[PDB]
Scaffold this active site. Structure first.
Site, PDB file in Angstrom:
ATOM      1  N   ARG A  51      31.223  32.967  40.138  1.00  0.00           N
ATOM      2  CA  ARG A  51      32.571  33.495  40.107  1.00  0.00           C
ATOM      3  C   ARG A  51      33.532  32.667  40.825  1.00  0.00           C
ATOM      4  O   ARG A  51      34.811  32.448  40.381  1.00  0.00           O
ATOM      5  CB  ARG A  51      32.541  34.857  40.832  1.00  0.00           C
ATOM      6  N   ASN A  91      30.089  41.991  34.029  1.00  0.00           N
ATOM      7  CA  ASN A  91      31.287  41.465  33.261  1.00  0.00           C
ATOM      8  C   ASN A  91      31.251  40.046  32.724  1.00  0.00           C
ATOM      9  O   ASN A  91      30.231  39.317  33.240  1.00  0.00           O
ATOM     10  CB  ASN A  91      32.533  41.458  34.639  1.00  0.00           C
ATOM     11  N   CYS A 145      33.595  50.419  32.293  1.00  0.00           N
ATOM     12  CA  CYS A 145      34.553  49.760  33.364  1.00  0.00           C
ATOM     13  C   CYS A 145      35.058  50.871  34.008  1.00  0.00           C
ATOM     14  O   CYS A 145      34.830  52.055  33.687  1.00  0.00           O
ATOM     15  CB  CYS A 145      35.528  49.288  32.550  1.00  0.00           C
ATOM     16  N   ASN A 146      35.746  50.526  35.217  1.00  0.00           N
ATOM     17  CA  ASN A 146      36.238  51.825  36.028  1.00  0.00           C
ATOM     18  C   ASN A 146      37.744  51.757  36.093  1.00  0.00           C
ATOM     19  O   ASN A 146      38.117  52.827  36.653  1.00  0.00           O
ATOM     20  CB  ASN A 146      35.755  51.371  37.512  1.00  0.00           C
ATOM     21  N   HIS A 202      39.863  45.791  30.219  1.00  0.00           N
ATOM     22  CA  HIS A 202      40.745  45.086  30.852  1.00  0.00           C
ATOM     23  C   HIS A 202      41.913  44.637  30.136  1.00  0.00           C
ATOM     24  O   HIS A 202      42.586  43.643  30.544  1.00  0.00           O
ATOM     25  CB  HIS A 202      39.983  43.731  31.677  1.00  0.00           C
ATOM     26  N   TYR A 260      45.149  44.596  34.599  1.00  0.00           N
ATOM     27  CA  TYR A 260      45.137  43.180  34.208  1.00  0.00           C
ATOM     28  C   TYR A 260      45.985  42.682  33.102  1.00  0.00           C
ATOM     29  O   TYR A 260      45.956  41.462  33.075  1.00  0.00           O
ATOM     30  CB  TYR A 260      43.592  43.237  33.584  1.00  0.00           C
ATOM     31  N   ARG A 308      39.493  35.047  45.404  1.00  0.00           N
ATOM     32  CA  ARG A 308      38.703  36.320  45.553  1.00  0.00           C
ATOM     33  C   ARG A 308      37.326  36.451  45.709  1.00  0.00           C
ATOM     34  O   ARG A 308      36.727  37.072  46.710  1.00  0.00           O
ATOM     35  CB  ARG A 308      39.271  37.178  44.257  1.00  0.00           C
TER      36      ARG A 308
END
Ligand SMILES: NC(=O)c1ccc[n+]([C@@H]2O[C@H](COP(=O)([O-])OP(=O)(O)OC[C@H]3O[C@@H](n4cnc5c(N)ncnc54)[C@H](O)[C@@H]3O)[C@@H](O)[C@H]2O)c1
Ligand SMILES: NC(=O)c1ccc[n+]([C@@H]2O[C@H](COP(=O)([O-])OP(=O)(O)OC[C@H]3O[C@@H](n4cnc5c(N)ncnc54)[C@H](O)[C@@H]3O)[C@@H](O)[C@H]2O)c1
Ligand SMILES: NC(=O)c1ccc[n+]([C@@H]2O[C@H](COP(=O)([O-])OP(=O)(O)OC[C@H]3O[C@@H](n4cnc5c(N)ncnc54)[C@H](O)[C@@H]3O)[C@@H](O)[C@H]2O)c1
Ligand SMILES: NC(=O)c1ccc[n+]([C@@H]2O[C@H](COP(=O)([O-])OP(=O)(O)OC[C@H]3O[C@@H](n4cnc5c(N)ncnc54)[C@H](O)[C@@H]3O)[C@@H](O)[C@H]2O)c1
Ligand SMILES: O=P(O)(O)OC[C@H]1O[C@@H](O)[C@H](O)[C@@H](O)[C@@H]1O
Ligand SMILES: O=P(O)(O)OC[C@H]1O[C@@H](O)[C@H](O)[C@@H](O)[C@@H]1O
Ligand SMILES: O=P(O)(O)OC[C@H]1O[C@@H](O)[C@H](O)[C@@H](O)[C@@H]1O
Ligand SMILES: O=P(O)(O)OC[C@H]1O[C@@H](O)[C@H](O)[C@@H](O)[C@@H]1O
Lengths: 409, 409, 409, 414
Positions: free
Chosen positions: B87, B140, B162-163, B192, B235, B255
Site C-alpha cells: 500500500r 481492494n 464496499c462500505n 469507489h 472518491y 495513509r
C-alpha cells in the site's frame, strides 16, 4: 444543380472552388452561390473565384442565408462563429487556469460549440423548411455539431467533415505510390479524436509497414506504437501529452494569431492572384475542401465510393451504441451514406470516445436549456476540463467573453 | 453451515465477527474458519474473537486456504496482497510524477490490482474445485477484482462489497429516523466511483431534502450539487479535485504509514481486550462488517432484501452494457442476486464509468497476457494515469516494487 | 384513496371486492367506484357487493367513465369490448376457415384487440388528463393491450395482469405446503404465451420435482417435458397441438355460449346471495381478484414484493429487446414496478415470443392507420392466422361482424 | 500471385456453368488452376472432360483424388456437393408428406434432415481448410444460410460465405425491366436464405420500388401472391415464402405430383448423357432451378480478388445491416466486397412482418445446430417442434424416428 457556400469570405474558398471545378466534368454544376455576414471580405474571395472559374459555371452572391440555400442541392457550412477573436478567447482563456487552450479540443471546443449551436440551429431550420439540401459541414467543432444536428435537431442530411482522414490517406497513398482510393482503413473515433487500427493499400495489409515508417520530442515515441497498437490522431497529444502540450501553447503567441497573419497575407494576394497561391498550405486546414468536393461528387453518382465522414455509428463499431456520431468510413452512393461494418473497437480508443461523447451531449443539453448550471456540469465532464476549484470562474470568463453569441441563465 | 474468512489477521476481523454474531440469531452458523499467511498475527486476533464469541459458534483456524474453504458455504476475501508495504508503494511511487497516489484509485489501484489478480486466480480456482462457495470480497480494488472474476475467470458466485453504500444508507436512515431497509436508492457506478441520483425513504422521494441537507452539513461546493444533481462518491474528489488532492496527499504522511501505527496499537489492545476498542473507528473500513453479515443473512433466507453490491449490470442501467460490473442495488434471496431496473444513467456519471471500465479491462488483459507493453497501454488509459513522458519510468518502478507478486514480460 | 372499477357489471366483481376487502386491513381504502355501460346489469352486482362490504369502505356508482377515474389512485380495466357476442364471433368465425377460434389466441385475439384499442385509447387519454392513476388491466387480450398502451400510447402506469402466474404459484405452494410468497420462478413470455424454466420454493431449486410431478398428473406427454425442459402455459396447446385443439373447439359448443349460460345463472343468484356462490368457479378467471388486490396492496406499501406482471422487459430477459412487453416477475414497491434480472431466454420460447410480438405490433400499426391493407398483413403474420387464400374473406367477415367497434379503410 | 480455385462436388451437373462463369472473370483476374474433387470419380470424370473441352486451355483443369489435395493450395473453395445425394433429397421431400407436412429440399422438415446430413461433412471439410490453406469458402450446399450460421457462429470460421441464386435472379429481372446493368440495381434486401424480403429497389439511384410493385401485378398462376398481398405487406417476398403463407396450397401441390428429387434424377441422367459429347452447354441445364448460381459465385470471387469494391448479396453476420436484429444473426444481405473482405452495409430497420419469420426460423436454426453438436435426439425433437412448418407434438416423435432411420449412414443421434 446548385451549391450554396456559407462563409464565402473564407480564405479556403479558392481551394473549395478548385475542388468543385475538378468534379464539374463528372457532375453538372450550374451555380455556386456564396453568403457571408462580411460582405466586403467575401467580395474579395468570390472576385478571385470568378477569375478561376471563368464562366465554366455561374458564381453568385446572396444577400441573405435563405436566399443562398433556397434552390440548393448542397449547402456547405464553412463559417467561423465569433471569428478569429472568438478563437483567440477559446485558446487564451483556458491557459489562465492551467488548461489546454485549443480551437477544437477541450475548453476551447466547448466555447466554440456554444457559439456555433444557435447559428447552426437557425440555419438547419431554414434549409429544412426550404430546399431540404444535404449540408456538408466544416464548421468546428465539426463532430460535436454533427452530433447536435443528427441527434437533437434530427436533420438526417447533415454530414460532418474534417481534414485528418483525407490527409492520412494522402500520406499513405504517397508512401506506397498509389491512388487515394487504393487506401482502405479501419478508422473510428470522434472528429479530432480518431484511431486507425488497420491500413490496406490495394488490398494488401500494410499496417506493420506503416508502424515502422512512423518510427523512421512532441511526437509519440516508438514504444507508444508498439504498446497501444493504434495510429492515433495528432490531436490526442493534448490528451496523452497534456503537460508537454500545455508547455508549448503557453510559451508562444496563440495559434489564432498566426493563422490571422497567414489569412491577411492571402487576402492581399487574392486581390490580384490569377492562380491559387502557395502560402495556402501554411494553413493546417488544407484538403478539407477537396474532401468536400469528392464527397459531393460521389453523392451525385451511383458508382459507390468510400469516404470517412461524421455520421451515426449504426453498427460500424459493434461495441459502441448505434446513435454515437463517429468519424468512420462510409459507402457513399446516390445521395445516401451507408455505414460499413468494422468489427470491435479497442478499449483504449473507447476510453476516449465514450468520455468525450458524454461531454458532447452534456454541452448540447446545457445549450438547449440555456443553463449555466448544466454548462458547469458539461465543463466538469471533459477529460481536459477544469477542476472543481476553477470551474465556476472559468465558465464565468467564457460567458463574459462570448456574451454576443451565447446567453445562459 | 460454515463461513471461511481469508485474511483472519485483519484488524477488522472482530467487527466482522460481531456482525456474524448478530445475524446468528436469524440464521444458523455452525463454524467460522480463519486462514491467514501470517499465523502469529492471526492467532492474537482469533484469540480475541473466541473471547467475543463465547461458543455461540465454533471458531477454527486452518493452516491452509484449501482447509478453510473446503466445506464452506461462504468465503470472505479480506486479505491485503503485499501488505501495508505494498500500500505504501502504491501511494508513494506515483507522487514523484505529479500523480495521485491512493490505495484504490488511479495508479495505486493499478499496482494493487496486479498484486491481487494472481492470488485471487489461485483462490477462486480452489474454491471452484471444492465447495463452490459464494465468495464475498472486501479485498481492494474490490470492483475491479469483481470485474476480473465475473468476466474473465467466469465464476458467477463472486460478490464484490464496499462500505460506501451502507454508510450512505446509514446517514440517510439517521437523517430521517428510519431503518436501513426503509432507504431505497437509485445508485450506480463503479466501486469507489458511484453516483446517487434519487433517494427514497419509506417510499417518499426525499432527494431534494438530501441535497438541501448536504449544503448545511475538501468537499464539493453547493453549486456543484445544483449543477451536477448527483450525490457523488467521496472518491470522485480524486478526479474532480485532482490538484487539491495531490497537494494534500503529497504534503502529509502517507495513509499507509498511519494505518501501520493504528494497526500496531490495535494489535497490542487485542491481546487483552474484552470488548471491541473504540480505536477501530480510526480506520475507514467501518460497517464493512454489517454489509457482509447482512448480505450473508439475506443470501441464507428466502425473504428478499436489497443490497448494493458489485455485480454484472444486466439491465440495471439501460444505457450501459449488460456485462459491465457495477456497484448497484440488487434483490438478494436464497443464494441469488438479482439486478433491479433503474432506468438511464446520467451522462456525467457515464463519462467516468466508461473510462474507468475500459481502464479495468486493459489492466486485466495486460495481466492475463503477462505483458509489459499492454500494461503501459492500461496505465495510459486511466484518467489519473501518467502522461506518455512518464509512463515507462513509472511502470518500471511499479514492476520493480512488486516483483515478488507479479511478473510482466 | 379511491379505486375505480371499469366494467362493474362483470360476474367476477364480487371476487374482486372480496380481494379488496382482504387487503383493506393492510392498506387504507376509502371508496370503490364502479362504472359500466350497462347500468341495470351493474346495479344487481353492485347491490350484492354492498351486502358483502358492510360499509367497510364506501361503494359508489358513477354514471360516467370520467366520474369514476377523476379522483382514483387505481383504475381496474375489467370490461369486455363487444360483450360475449363479440367473443362468440371471435371463437366461431375462424373455424369455417380451419383456424383456431379462441377468446385470446390467434385470429380471435386479433378481432378482440381491434375492439379493445379504441376504448382503451379513449380511457387512457381520460385517465392521463385527470388522475394519472395506475391502471391495472384484466381486459383481454391483456398483454397485447399492454404492449399498445406502454409502447404506442406511452402511458407508463399501465400494468397488464393475467391469472395463469398466480394459479401456477398457488399450485406449487400447495404441492410443497408453503406460502405463495415462498414460490419464486424464472418465468417469461407473453400473456398466454409463457414459459417457466425454474421453480424455487423457500430458496430450494425444486424444478426437477415439479417436472416429476407433472407426469403423475389434451396435455403434453412426458417426453415433451423431457425434451423441451420448460413448463409451458396451457395456451401453448393451440400452437403445438393445433390439429387436436381445432378438432376439440369445432365439435363442441362455443365457450362464449357456455359462459352466457353460466353468467345468466350467476346474475339470478346475485339478486339474493349473501355469500359468493360456488358456481363462480365454473368460470376460468378465478384468482384474477387476488392478483389485482395483492398488486395494489404491494404498490401501496414500501415492503417490496414479487408479482408476475405484463411490463417492458428492460433487461429481465437479456436476449430479448428491452422494449418487448413481457409477462415477467417484478419487484413491486411504493408505486413502482422494477424488472428483475433472469438471464437468457430459451430459443424454443423465443421462437414463439418473437413471432407473436411481431404480430402484436403489426396489429397495432394496422389499427393506428385504420388500414385494411395493414390488417391483412398483421393477420398473415400470426402463427395461427390464415393462409393467403383465406385472408381476404376472413378479414372481411371479421370487419363486418365488428362494424360497431372498429372501422378500417 | 499464382491462384487456385477448388471445387468440391465437381460431378454436379451445374459444373459447366460454374466453369463458364470462371472463364468470364478470367479476363479480369488471374486464375491458374481449377481443381475438382468428388466422392464419385466416374461421374465427375465425364463432367470434367466436358469442362476441359470448354476451357480450351485458358487455365489448368485438375482432378484431386482427395478433399485435402483439392484445397491445400487453394485461395477459394467452392462447396457445391449434396450430402446424401438425390436419394437423401428424396427422403427429405417424401417423408414429411404422410404427416401432412411440407416436404421440400431446403424448407421445413426437409431442410432439417438435409442440415443434419450436411453438418458432419462441413465440420470435417472446414477443419481441413482451416488447418491448410485457410481459403475463403464459397458455399452453395443447401441449406446454405443454415450452414453459414453453423460455420460462422459455431465453428467460428470467418471466411465462409453462403450464397444462393434468388438475389442475383431478382437483380437480373430488375436490370431487364429497366434496361440497366446488374450493378445499377441496388436493394434494401434482408432475411434468411430462402426467407428474404425486398423493401426498396433502386436503379441508377432512382427509387423505382412502386414501379416494381405495379409491374408484379401485370406479370404457374394459382401459386403467386395476389395483388392485395403486395398492397398490404408492401414487401417483395422470396418465392419460398409460399411454403409458409400458402401452406395448404403448397402441401396439396407437392403431395399430388412427382417428388422434385425424382424429376431431377431424370433431368440429371439426360444431362450426363449429353455431357459425353457436348461441345457447348446444353439448353436442358435451364430445366434446373439453380441457374445463375454460377455468375453469383464467379462475380463474388472476382470482386473478392480486386480492390474495386462491389455489392453482392451474400449470407453473413448481420453486424448492423438491420439495426433491429441482433448483430450475430447470419442473414442474406447486401455487402461491400473488396480485396478478400465482406463488409456489411447499413440498411436501417427491418419490417415486423419480415422479422416474425426471420426470428422464428433463426431460433429453429440454432436449436438444430445445438441438437447436432450434442448428438441429441431429445434436442432434435425440440428443434423440430420449433420450426413454423414442423410437426405437431402428436407426430414429432415418429417423424424424427423416420428421419434418423433414413439418415443413419450420415448422422447418429442418441
Ligand atoms: N474552409 C475550410 O476548408 C476549412 C478548413 C479548416 C477548418 N474549417 C472550419 O470551418 C470554419 C471556417 O474557418 P476558416 O478557416 O474558413 O476561417 P474564416 O474566419 O475565414 O471563416 C469563414 C467566414 O465565415 C464568416 N462567418 C462568421 N460567422 C458567420 C455566420 N454566422 N454566418 C455566415 N458566415 C459567417 C466569416 O465572416 C468568414 O468570412 C471554422 O470553424 C474552421 O475550423 C474550414
Ligand atoms: N476487513 C475489512 O472489512 C476491510 C475494510 C476496508 C478495506 N478492506 C480491504 O480488504 C483488505 C484487507 O485489509 P485490512 O486493512 O483489513 O487488513 P490487513 O492489511 O491487515 O490485511 C489483512 C490480512 O490479510 C493477510 N494476507 C495478506 N496476503 C494474504 C494472502 N495472500 N492470503 C491470505 N491472507 C493474506 C495479512 O496477513 C493480514 O493479516 C484490503 O485490501 C482492504 O483494502 C477490508
Ligand atoms: N374480472 C376478472 O377478474 C376477469 C377474469 C378473467 C378475464 N377477465 C377479462 O376482463 C373482461 C371481463 O370479463 P367478463 O367475463 O366479466 O365479461 P363481461 O361480459 O361480464 O364484461 C364485463 C362488463 O364490462 C362492461 N363493458 C363492456 N364494454 C365496456 C366499455 N366500453 N366501458 C365500460 N364497461 C364496458 C359490460 O357491460 C360488462 O358488464 C374480459 O375481457 C375478460 O377476458 C376479467
Ligand atoms: N451447383 C450449383 O450451382 C447449385 C445450384 C442450386 C443448388 N445447389 C445446392 O448445391 C448442392 C449440389 O447441387 P446439385 O444439384 O449439383 O446436386 P448433386 O446431387 O449433383 O451433387 C453434386 C455432387 O456432390 C457430390 N457429393 C456428394 N457428397 C459429397 C461429399 N461428401 N464430398 C464431395 N462431393 C460429394 C455428388 O457425387 C455430386 O457429384 C445441393 O445441396 C443444392 O441444393 C447448387
Ligand atoms: O490553425 P489552422 O490553420 O486554422 O488549422 C486548424 C485545422 O487543423 C487541421 O489539422 C484540423 O483537422 C482542422 O480541423 C483544423 O481546423
Ligand atoms: O486508510 P484505511 O483505514 O485503510 O481506509 C481505506 C478505506 O476507505 C473507505 O472509505 C473505502 O470505501 C474502503 O474501501 C477503503 O479501503
Ligand atoms: O372461458 P372463461 O370462463 O371466460 O375463462 C377464460 C379465462 O381462462 C384463463 O385460464 C385465462 O388465463 C384467462 O385470461 C381467461 O379469460
Ligand atoms: O429442383 P432443383 O433443380 O434442384 O432446383 C432447386 C433450386 O431452386 C432455386 O430457386 C433455389 O434458390 C436453389 O437454392 C434450389 O436448390
Amino acid at each position: 444543380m446548385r451549391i450554396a457556400v456559407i462563409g464565402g469570405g473564407s480564405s479556403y474558398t479558392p481551394e473549395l472552388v478548385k475542388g468543385l471545378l475538378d468534379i464539374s466534368e463528372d457532375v453538372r454544376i450550374d451555380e455556386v452561390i456564396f453568403y457571408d455576414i462580411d460582405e466586403e471580405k467575401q467580395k474579395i474571395v468570390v472576385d478571385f473565384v470568378k477569375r478561376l472559374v471563368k464562366d465554366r459555371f455561374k458564381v453568385l452572391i446572396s444577400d441573405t442565408f435563405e436566399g443562398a440555400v433556397v434552390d440548393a442541392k448542397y449547402v456547405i457550412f464553412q463559417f467561423r462563429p465569433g471569428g478569429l477573436k472568438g478563437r483567440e478567447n477559446d485558446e487564451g482563456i483556458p491557459l489562465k487556469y492551467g488548461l489546454i487552450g485549443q480551437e477544437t479540443t477541450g475548453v476551447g471546443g466547448f466555447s466554440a460549440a456554444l457559439r456555433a449551436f444557435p447559428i447552426v440551429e437557425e440555419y438547419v431550420d431554414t434549409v429544412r423548411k426550404t430546399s431540404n439540401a444535404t449540408i456538408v459541414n466544416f464548421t468546428n467543432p465539426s463532430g460535436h455539431i454533427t452530433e447536435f444536428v443528427r441527434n437533437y435537431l434530427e436533420y438526417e442530411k447533415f454530414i460532418g467533415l474534417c481534414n485528418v482522414p483525407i490527409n492520412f490517406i494522402r500520406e499513405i497513398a504517397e508512401m506506397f505510390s498509389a491512388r487515394l482510393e487504393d487506401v482502405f482503413l479501419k478508422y473510428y473515433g470522434l472528429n479530432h479524436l480518431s484511431f486507425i487500427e488497420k491500413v490496406f493499400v490495394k488490398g494488401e495489409d500494410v499496417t506493420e509497414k506503416v508502424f515502422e515508417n512512423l518510427k523512421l520530442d512532441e511526437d509519440f515515441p516508438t514504444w507508444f506504437y508498439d504498446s497501444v497498437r493504434l495510429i492515433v490522431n495528432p490531436y490526442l497529444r493534448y490528451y496523452l501529452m497534456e503537460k508537454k502540450m500545455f508547455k508549448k501553447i503557453s510559451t508562444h503567441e496563440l495559434r489564432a494569431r498566426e493563422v490571422m497573419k497567414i489569412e491577411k497575407e492571402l487576402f492581399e494576394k487574392y486581390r490580384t492572384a490569377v492562380e491559387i497561391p502557395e502560402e495556402l498550405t501554411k494553413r493546417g486546414g488544407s484538403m478539407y475542401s477537396t474532401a468536400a468536393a469528392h464527397l459531393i461528387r460521389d453523392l451525385e453518382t451511383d458508382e459507390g465510393k468510400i469516404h470517412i465522414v461524421n455520421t451515426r455509428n449504426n453498427g460500424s463499431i459493434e461495441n459502441l451504441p448505434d446513435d454515437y456520431v463517429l468519424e468512420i468510413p462510409c459507402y457513399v452512393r446516390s445521395g445516401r451514406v451507408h455505414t460499413l461494418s468494422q468489427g470491435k473497437g479497442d478499449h483504449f480508443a473507447l476510453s476516449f470516445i465514450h468520455a468525450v461523447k458524454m461531454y458532447e451531449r452534456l454541452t448540447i443539453e446545457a445549450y438547449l436549456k440555456r443553463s449555466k448550471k448544466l454548462a458547469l456540469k458539461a465543463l466538469l465532464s471533459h477529460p481536459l476540463g477544469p477542476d472543481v476549484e476553477d470551474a465556476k470562474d472559468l465558465l464565468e470568463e467564457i460567458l463574459e467573453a462570448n456574451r454576443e453569441y451565447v446567453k445562459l441563465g
